[PDB]
Design a protein around this ligand. Structure first.
Ligand code: AMP
Ligand code: AMP
Ligand code: ZN
Ligand code: ZN
Lengths: 139, 139
């Protein structure tokens, strides 16, 4: 899977990513074509393609991780006032990487975003990791 | 809550909706301003506002229900080839109803959708309910 799927390769540590979150089942990385700074992908470590073949428990967990990252962005040095959470199920819904995943796109009041390059993704990653660490400390 | 929040009112049976799904914790209804036919909102029966105050278990479950509706749309007479799942967390992310909810927007190959009126929402509801009933029978 690692040699044929870029998200499997990243999960296996065989392809590069700016990683911001990881647990037993999910990996959160920065998108390489961010809509906004801190645009994050939540990627189940098991390869399935979309909503037709992904266990509900995986979709459920992916959403929960997405929430955690959303909360972090809102308290982070990226100054998020909100977030768009998205799953693009199938090619007709804009799917281009055929390993299921969920987007967390940080938003800011008056950002005039319409639905793609971050001047310093490493900084955005560091800010999100610091915010996630802070949420962890508070619990 | 029912008199001050339109989604609470719908959950309480105090305001109209075309309902397509219901369990102990969630209600799925047709959006009144659909992006596509069968555009569905999944609404937790408990009122919370966004990702900052909604229990993770609720976000997780909302996503699972959204998946079920997505799968139904794909096998339905609305002919969905895919779906966009969205949560708009906060006003900065386009939130306009301040009771947390999740969008399932059916998509079709070559539909040229860009991110709003259904000629027959009752028909779209009937088609989704029939597809959901069919998924239930298969399990
Ligand atoms: N190697 C990669 N690392 C990080 N993000 C990626 C990589 N390849 C593709 N993406 C992103 O994954 C998303 C896939 O699109 P979609 O399938 O519509 O969610 C896009 O936003 C891409 O920019
Ligand atoms: N009474 C209602 N019944 C069904 N859908 C509604 C109603 N009022 C608002 N909506 C929809 O709820 C969504 C709220 O926007 P957002 O908060 O961005 O998800 C919009 O797509 C509205 O068209
Ligand atoms: Zn994969
Ligand atoms: Zn409410």
């Amino acid at each position: 899977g690692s040699m044929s799927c870029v998200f499997c390769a990243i999960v296996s540590g065989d392809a590069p990513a700016i990683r911001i979150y990881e647990d037993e089942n999910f990996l959160g990385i920065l998108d390489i074509r961010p809509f906004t700074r801190g645009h994050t992908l939540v990627i189940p470590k098991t390869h399935t393609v979309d909503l037709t073949d992904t266990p509900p428990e995986t979709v459920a967990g992916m959403a929960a991780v997405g929430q955690r990252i959303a909360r972090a962005a809102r308290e982070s040095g990226l100054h998020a006032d909100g977030n768009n959470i998205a799953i693009n199920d199938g090619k007709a819904a804009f799917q281009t990487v055929f390993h299921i995943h969920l987007h967390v796109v940080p938003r800011r009041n008056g950002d005039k975003l319409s639905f793609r390059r971050d001047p310093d993704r490493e900084e955005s990653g560091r800010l999100l990791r610091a915010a996630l660490a802070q949420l962890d400390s508070a619990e």
